[PDB]
Amino acid sequence: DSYLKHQEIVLDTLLPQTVSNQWRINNDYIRQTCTIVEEMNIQQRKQINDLEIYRKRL
Amino acid sequence: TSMKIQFKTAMPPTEVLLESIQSKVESIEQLQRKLQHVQPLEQQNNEMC
C-alpha cells in the first residue's frame, strides 16, 4: 500500500511539470498576439486616412 | 473430513483476513483508480503541450 502511494505522487508531479510548460508556451504567444494586433491596428488607421485623403485631394 | 476441517479453517482465515484486508483492498484499489485518472490527464496535457 505504501509503494502505491510513491507510485501515485510521481504521476501528479508530471501533471504539474506539463501544466507549467503548457501555460508557459501560451504565455509567450499572448505577448506576440498583442504586439502584432497593435501593429495591424496602426496599419488600418493609416489605411483609412489615405482612403479619405485621396478623395479630399481630388 | 478435510473439506470440513480445512474449509472451516479457510473460512475463518478468509473472514479474519477479509475484515482486515477488504479495508486495505479498498485502500489499495481506490488508489489504483487514481493512477487511471492521473495517466489519462497526463496524456491530454502532453498532447496539448
Backbone angles phi and psi of B20, in degrees to 5: -85, -35
Residues of chain A with C-beta less than 8 angstroms from the C-beta of B37 = none
Across the interface, of B38, B41, B45, the residue whose CB is closest to A8 is B38
CA dist A46 and A40 (Å) reads 10
Whole-angstrom CA distances from A18 to A10, A15, A24, A36, B9 are: 13, 5, 10, 28, 52
CA dist B34 and B24 (Å) reads 15
Q: Answer yes or no: are the C-beta atoms of A25 and B49 closer than 8 Å.
A: yes
Q: Answer yes or no: are the C-beta atoms of B42 and A14 closer than 8 Å.
A: yes
Q: Answer yes or no: are the C-beta atoms of A7 and B38 closer than 8 Å.
A: no
How far B17 CA sits from the closest chain A CA (Å)? Answer: 16
**What angle (nearest 5°) sits at the alpha carbon of residue A58, between those of residues A46 and A49?**
10
Resolution (A): 3.6
Residues of chain A with C-beta less than 8 angstroms from the C-beta of B48 = 22
Q: Which three cell numbers stand for residue B15?
A: 473472514
Q: Answer yes or no: are the C-beta atoms of A11 and B35 closer than 8 Å.
A: yes
Elucidation technique: cryo-EM
**What angle (nearest 5°) sits at the alpha carbon of residue B17, between those of residues B34 and A5?**
25
CA dist B42 and B49 (Å) reads 10
CA dist B22 and A46 (Å) reads 75
Across the interface, of A1, A8, A15, the residue whose CB is closest to B45 is A15
**What angle (nearest 5°) sits at the alpha carbon of residue A42, between those of residues A37 and A44?**
95
Q: String of b and e for A23-42 (b: at least 16 CB within 10 Å)?
A: eeeeeeeeeeeeeeeeeeee
